[model samples]
Target: MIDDDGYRPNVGIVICNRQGQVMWARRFGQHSWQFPQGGINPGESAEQAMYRELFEEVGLSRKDVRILASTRNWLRYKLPKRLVRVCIGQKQKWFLLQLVSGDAEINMQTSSTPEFDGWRWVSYWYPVRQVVSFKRDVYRRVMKEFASVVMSLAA
Candidate 1:
């Protein structure tokens, strides 16, 4: 849901695998890549929104991935560009998920209109540098915050 400030409440997902590689997705016509994130429905908490987005966007569910940690404050970004109205930016809650199932569980066909058209695993540091401009800080912060957790999980 969007706020009075025109900022949408969303969840930013950071799902790193056993090898510590994160699942990265390609937006429709977006040669650029991003973490699987989505807007929160009314009455939904950030965790619920994250699982919902994980299921619909990347084909993962609660039983498939476990939430290890999350951002305490809203990680915000201004203008992924253009929106319905007064849409200045997005205020996101970032979550770090550790996969419970293997890689084969990731599927992008659940949603009628999928958020991403393609997906791949990337080095944990890759997206911090390569994600779109609006996403850089959030990506960098999430990874930075989840730093030790990711290393231990992979090790």
Candidate 2:
């Protein structure tokens, strides 16, 4: 739902492997590649949405992942003016999730409306340079804020 500030409540997930490779997925039927993310339902908390989106987009059960870190506050990004008709912006609770189960279990068909078409494991900070330009700023911010936690787990 759109809030008063022209942003929707959402969650962004950075799923990582023990070696710190992030799960980057190609958007379904599109060229865009992004970490898993989705809207928070009206009654759900940010953390709740994070897990739900994780399962819906990546086919990961609660047993498949571990929480590493999360942003201290909501991070936001505006959709480009060309797409403002779709939505104004996104305010997200970002998370860092580490894969605890085998990577082979990661599937893109968990949901009837799958969010991704293909997926790969890339370096932790790689998506910062690779995400859509409109989202780069927020990705940078989240990476900066959670770098230490990520590094701690990486080592």
Candidate 3:
């Protein structure tokens, strides 16, 4: 959620197959693509917000993923002044996780509020080129932060 300060505290998942194809989704009725992430609710910790976003956005559960690692600290990004809220800032922290379940288990219809109208598994490096330009740097940072763990593609 882009806030008044332009800083949005959110979390995301980078789930990949052994072949290193990251899970990517297209927002419902829109061309925008992104990892599953949303705003943190009041009093919700980052982990809690992440789990909720993960389930409602991707239809995944805690049992289906392995939490390999997460940002040791917040990774912040700034929106252009026009993009930024006149009163707030823009920033987000991302989580790096491994999928414990096979690809078949990811059902777009399973999510209560499917953010994506369609989904596909793409190269782990694809998001940098595909995500909206404004968010590309943050996506790159998130991917790079987790690259080591997913460096090898098994397929």
Candidate 4:
């Protein structure tokens, strides 16, 4: 939904492994790599959307993840006028969750409505550099908040 700032409110999920590597996916039919993210459904809160998106895009369920830290508030990005839809806002609540269960549960093509074409495990720092330019700031903020937890796993 569009907020007062004229940005569409969305939710992003950064799903990490116990060892701190986050899952990354290539958008269906595209080369873009990003955390599993999607627009919030009508009547769904950001947390709900994040979980739903987690499965829809990356093929995982709550049974496979542990909520680590989520962005305290909305982080926004303006779609370049060329990329922005004429009437939507650009705000998002980014969630950083770790996979407390089996990583083998992730299979991009397993679902009937999978949103990604492929998936891989990557370092926590990867998305900040790999996500689309318009969404980089949100990625940076999400990683900053969860980095310590991830680092703890690394050491």
Candidate 5:
């Protein structure tokens, strides 16, 4: 649901491997690559939406990963004016998660209408440069906020 400010509540996941690389995915039918992210359902908490999105978008269930940390506050970005009907922007609760199992648990085809077509692991900061222009700021902020936690995990 869009808030009075026109931003929709959402969640963004930064799934990282023990090696420090973060998972990035190509949007279904699109060339853009991004973290697993989705809108928060009406009755869901941020953590619940995050886990649901983690599975729906990446096919990795709760047992496959552990939460490292999350943004203490929502990070927001505006959509271009032309897409206001889809909401003016998204205010997201960003999560940092560490993969706990082998890569075999990842399945891009978990659903008929999958969120991702392919995926790869990259340096933690890579997504800030590769994500859509509108979302670059949010990605940068999320990475910055979680940098210490991620770096510690990598260590």
Candidate 6:
């Protein structure tokens, strides 16, 4: 649901591999790529939406990853189409998850209408330069907050 500020509630997931590289994905048949993200239903907790989106977008179930940390407050983004266009975009709670399995478990075809068609692991900082322009700041903020936590959690 969109809040009074006109931002939709959502969740963003950053799933990291053993080396601490984050998973990034491309929209089906499109060049656009980003993290696993989705809208939060009215009664659903942000964490719930995170896992659901994880499964829907990357074929990753809750049991396959461990939650490491999350953004302390909602990180908002407005598309540059209109200089972010009067707050009509989304505000999210970004999650950092450590993936427990190998690349074999990542199936971009898990759903009839999947969010991603291709996926790959990249340096934790890579998406900040590669994500959509409007969301770049938010991605940078998330990575800044999670960088050390990810390193600490590595085996």
lDDT of 6 by residue, 107-135 (tens): 98788878778888888778999988888
Per model, state how many residue pairs clash: 0, 0, 10, 5, 0, 0
Stretches off by above 4 angstroms in model 3 are 1-6, 80-89, 109-112, 152-155
Give stretches of model 2 more than 4 Å off: none
RMSD of 3: 2.8
Per-candidate TM-score against the hidden true structure? 0.93, 0.95, 0.84, 0.89, 0.94, 0.91
Candidate number that wins on TM-score, 2 or 3: 2
**Which has the better TM-score: candidate 3, or candidate 4?**
4
In candidate 4, what are the lDDT values of residues 1-155, reduced to their tens digit? 55566766688887776677888888888889877778887899888888887777777788888887888888877777776544444678878787777767887865687788888899778888888898787778778988898888667
The order of the candidates by lDDT, greatest first, is 5, 2, 6, 1, 4, 3
lDDT of 2 at 127: 91
Tens-digit lDDT track of model 5 for 1-155? 78899889999999888777899899889888999889999999999999888888888899999998999998889998876764788999999999999988998887667988889999987888888899998888898988888788779
Error of 5 at 154 (Å): 2.1
Task: State the displacement of the C-alpha of residue 90, model 2, in Å, after optimal TM-score superposition.
Answer: 0.5
Q: Model 1 over residues 13-37: C-alpha lDDT tens digits?
A: 8888878788888987768788888
Per-residue lDDT of model 2, residues 42-112, tens digit only: 99999988888888999998899888888888899999888877369999999888888998989999789
Residue 16, model 1: Cα distance from true site in angstroms? 0.7
Where in model 1 is the C-alpha error above 4 Å? 80-85
Model 6 off-target regions past 4 Å? 82-87
Error of 1 at 82 (Å): 6.3
Query: Ten consecutive residues with minimal summed lDDT in candidate 5?
Result: 80-89
Worst-scoring 10-residue span by lDDT in model 1: 79-88
* lDDT (Cα) of model 2: 0.87
Instruction: Score candidate 5 by lDDT.
Output: 0.88
Alpha-carbon runs more than 4 Å astray in model 5: none
- Candidates 3 and 5 compared by lDDT, better number: 5
C-alpha displacement of 127 in model 6, angstroms? Answer: 0.9
